Structure formats: C-alpha cells, structure tokens
Design a binder for this molecule. Structure first.
Ligand code: SF4
Lengths: 269, 269
C-alpha cells in the first residue's frame, strides 16, 4: 500500500489537486483512502459531493467510546474512502496531536484494509511545525508530494516542508516523490518550478494547468473527472495520476537557502 | 502599557498593517515595541528600513546563552523597538515554544520598561492552535485586533481566531478590540466587514484601502507614514492609530456558526 501525503501552503488549491489526483488514480483501477489533516480545507468534499462529512474529533466527542468506522469513513466518487481528522480545540491543543488520534482510530477500527492501493493524507503546510510533521515522523507517510505555485510564499513553504522531510529522511524512510505545480496564472511558471524542484534534487512530477473547469467542477462539488471526464483538464489529472503511480524517483531532499531561492526566482521566474 | 496582539491569516497583508499601525502611534508620541511571532512574513522588515533582523532563536543559537538585548531588539522607525521570535526548526519545533522563549528573554533582559506605551505581538492566524495562542495564554496580550478582508477564508480565520480569544476571555482579561479590514478589492467589502465584526459583538475599527502607496513603500521596505507623511495612505494609518489608542469597545467575542457566516457572505457579496 502506498502511504502518500500531500503538503503545501494554503490558498493555492492544494486540496482540490489532491482530490482530483485520486479520481485519476481511481480511473486506473486503484482502491484509495483519503484522510484530511487540513483544518483550513475541505479535503473530501469534491469526492463526497458537498457533504462536509463529520470529523473524527467531532465523532469522538459524540459517539464517544463506541465509535464505529462507517461513521468516520464515507465512500465517495468511484469508491474512494473518505475521512476527516478535524482541527484542534481553538486556542488550545495541537492539530498535529489530533491527526495522530484520527490515524490511530483508523488503524484501530481496521481501516487499513489489504485492498488499499493508496492512502493519502492531505496535510496543511502553512506551519511546518512538529505538529504538522506528525504523519512523517510517526511513519504514516513515506511518500510525500509537495504542491506549489510559482509564487515566493508557496515556494518558501515547499522549501520548508522539505527541511522537515529531510530531518526524517534517515531515521525513517520518508522521501520526497516530487513537486506538483498548481498554476495560479496564465503565466506558465513551468520553468521556475522545474528549476526549484531539481535544485532540491527532486522533480516537477506534473504541472497542473489553470483551467476554468476546475472552478466549475468545484462549484458543483465534484472533481473534474466526476464532473466531465472528456475535457483536457480531466486528462491533466489522469496524467498526474499515472506519473505518481509509475514514479521511481524518491529522494532525501536538499533544502535551499533563502538566497538560493531568490536566485532561482530571478533566473527562472 | 497596552499589551496588544494582531492576529490574522497570511496572504492578506496583516504584518504590513501591524507595522503601519505602530508607525501611526509613533506619530502620536507613543513609545512602542513590536514582537514578531509569525513565521509567514517579516513583522519588522518595514520598521527596520528593510533590515531583516536576526531572530531570538537564531541569536540564541548564535550568541548562545550570553544573549544581549541589543542584539535581538533593534530600534527602527521613529524609535520603534523591534524583535522577531524566530520560527520553529522545520518539522520539529512548535511555533509556541519559541514565542515563550523570546518573551522570557525580553523580560529577563529588562526590555519591558516603564517608558512603554505599547507592546504588539504580530501573530499568525492560519491555525488557531495552542502554540499560536502563546502570547494570550502566557497572559502577555490582553487586547486583540484581527486583520481580515472580504475573502471567505479570511473571515473564516477571523471567526476561528475569535473562538480562541473567547477560550481565555472568560477567565483572563483577554478581549477583542476590533476587526481591521485589509481591503482585497471585494464588492461591498465595507458593509460586509461591518456586519461580520458586528455579528461577533465587535466593530470594524478601520478599513484599510488598497493603494499603490503601500506597494511602493514595501519595495523600498518602508512604512507609508515614513515614506510620504503627506499622503492619504499615511494619513489612513494615523487615523487607524488614533482609533486604536482611543478605543473603548473591548469584548468577549461571540463566534458565529459556519451557517451564520455563509449567510452573511451571501447577504453581502
Ligand atoms: S506543534 Fe504546531 S499545531 Fe501543535 S500547538 Fe505547536 S504550532 Fe500548533
């Protein structure tokens, strides 16, 4: 079973990419589980159709000790099994800690079934603290893909995420499978991202194009593959899916200095 | 001395407003100290004329134990004392721990002097966790201002931040002083920001407009008052300052429901 995690700054469509990627993997005959660990994004909404399914932390406080799997895991588009961690008690508590609670409650309720081809953790990368690195540090996530756009703050976060990955790439076997560009503009910043990823010693595994369809599917609470399998954008996601599935490039990333960041920005951005 | 914290999500210029606000109070003969607690932007880079001061954490790493106050606190614009707590070691440290370390050092090095009119903690609003609630939790900050814009994610963060505020108001002196709008070109933004702040039991203390004045000053790494004092945007900040200094509305905020917020973003465009 591939235990993948998608990290990246908020505000750049990271959860939408993660969800769309799974439909692409489903289009390949894959059995997949998705676990949202992003208190700022609905991680399974495009897969379950507008249903902001109830979180694990929320189910506990009501289903208490007798919680049943089917309450926390809902089957979405194409059979993709969907779950949501739920955030930290506002102002107290640790998101990282609650992502741990949920994951352990999943194993405990036997959610990690031998038919799983994939499990994805959609993790917020705004704060790259020990709380958000929980899935990597605990061995839950071995293969990470970072989502970034050709903007400084998304590149900075990606670099930072790689710093955290790097620290665990040793004791554990977590590695970076690649960077995914979520084009946020008409300016195809393919070259910046490609340079940024190669500099880490990784690769731009796929460049997700700016499309007005992502927005339609989204309004309609669906992934582009559920909403309209025939468009170009649908093929984009199928292509991202196949490259992740076929991927053999797994590395201990080499973070860059801020200065190096700036140089890449100038030379390729 | 007024102990204020400025919370808000990143990506909407919260730190630029913090620095610009202090500038205004400087204009009022106010003696001020700024403590950056936000991994996202440089909370003092505009006060220090574009100077990226080392952080408390960097510094301690460097200067070790023998930490000098003058190394960590730098006087910038009009005498404003600047300090940056430094972010967490990527993948390991909790953002809160560093905040507490820094505040203790400042206290230990006698930075909390009698001549202080204000101390501001510029804090990240992306995750309303205990790590980020450290200035509040440690008692340090009793007066809160949340920076938001018409964007939905900004209002959600603001609402989420108010939950954390309320967790401590009812037992600590912590109160919400108001909502500050960093305008993001939103149709009917003002009426919307005012209904939101009102919904919480608070007020839209000031609407900061977008102007090419801010983008210029930050290319040079200055605050606007500093740039052209005669300038409406610099005057915008002076008004912001006199409105905060004279403020008398300080409340235990009433977080609204997700449905209550979506209603408002429906009713207000
Ligand atoms: S480790 Fe991170 S999520 Fe946990 S309390 Fe600290 S800053 Fe917050």
């Amino acid at each position: 079973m591939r235990q993948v995690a998608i990290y990246g700054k908020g505000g750049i469509g990271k959860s939408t990419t993660t969800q769309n990627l799974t439909s692409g993997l489903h289009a390949m005959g894959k059995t997949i589980m998705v676990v949202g660990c992003d208190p700022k994004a609905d991680s399974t909404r495009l897969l379950l159709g507008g249903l902001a399914q109830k979180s694990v932390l929320d189910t506990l406080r009501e289903e208490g000790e007798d919680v049943e799997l089917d309450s926390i895991l809902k089957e979405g588009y194409g059979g993709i099994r969907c779950v949501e961690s739920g955030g930290p008690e506002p102002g107290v508590g640790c998101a990282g800690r609650g992502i741990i609670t949920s994951i352990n409650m999943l194993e405990q309720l036997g959610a990690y079934t031998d038919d799983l081809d994939y499990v994805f953790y959609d993790v917020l990368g705004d704060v790259v603290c020990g709380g958000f690195a929980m899935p990597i540090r605990e061995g839950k996530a071995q293969e990470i893909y970072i989502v970034a756009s050709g903007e400084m703050m998304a590149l900075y976060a990606a670099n930072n995420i790689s710093k955290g990955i790097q620290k665990y790439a040793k004791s554990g076997g977590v590695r970076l499978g690649g960077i995914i560009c979520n084009s946020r503009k008409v300016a195809n910043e393919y070259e910046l991202l490609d340079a940024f990823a190669k500099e880490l010693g990784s690769q731009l595994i796929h460049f997700v194009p700016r499309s007005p369809m992502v927005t339609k599917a989204e309004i309609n609470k669906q992934t582009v593959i559920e909403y309209d399998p025939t468009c170009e954008q649908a093929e984009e996601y199928r292509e991202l899916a196949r490259k992740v599935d076929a991927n053999e490039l797994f590395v201990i990333p080499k973070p860059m200095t801020q200065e190096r960041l700036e140089e890449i920005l100038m030379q390729y951005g």
